């Protein structure tokens, strides 16, 4: 049922704004995790866009998921809360993928 929801009506994208001033190494590490999650969701067939719009249904984010009300109205997460669109942390996304059993570790002449 979750897979049906995904491959039929799940429009997804990932926040590119971070709430921590990490060093380049840690930034690359979270980016690699982001890529792994991208491939995981692609395996399940949900759409992954390249821009936030009301059509999107899940945003996946590194920042805090308990303090959206403190952000700007123009803020992407504030928009998500207003539109009732589902917000996940990276840990939540990994948990969802593992629960769905998506393995991430795996002329001249």
């Amino acid at each position: 049922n979750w897979k049906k929801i995904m491959k039929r009506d799940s429009r997804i994208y990932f926040d590119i704004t971070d709430d921590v001033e990490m060093n380049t190494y840690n930034k690359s590490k979270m980016d690699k995790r982001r890529d792994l999650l991208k491939r995981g969701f692609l395996t399940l067939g949900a759409q992954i866009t390249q821009f936030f719009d009301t059509t999107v249904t899940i945003v996946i984010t590194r920042r805090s998921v308990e303090n959206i009300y403190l952000l700007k109205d123009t803020d992407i997460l504030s928009r998500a809360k207003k539109n009732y669109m589902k917000v996940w942390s990276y840990e939540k996304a990994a948990r969802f993928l593992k629960n769905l059993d998506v393995d991430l570790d795996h002329y001249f002449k």
Partner: peptide
């Protein structure tokens, strides 16, 4: 500037710059 371009949107929710 990248974040501005890829995350801005009006109340309607349509990607103006997209």
């Amino acid at each position: 500037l990248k974040s501005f371009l890829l995350e801005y949107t009006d109340e309607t929710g349509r990607s103006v710059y997209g």
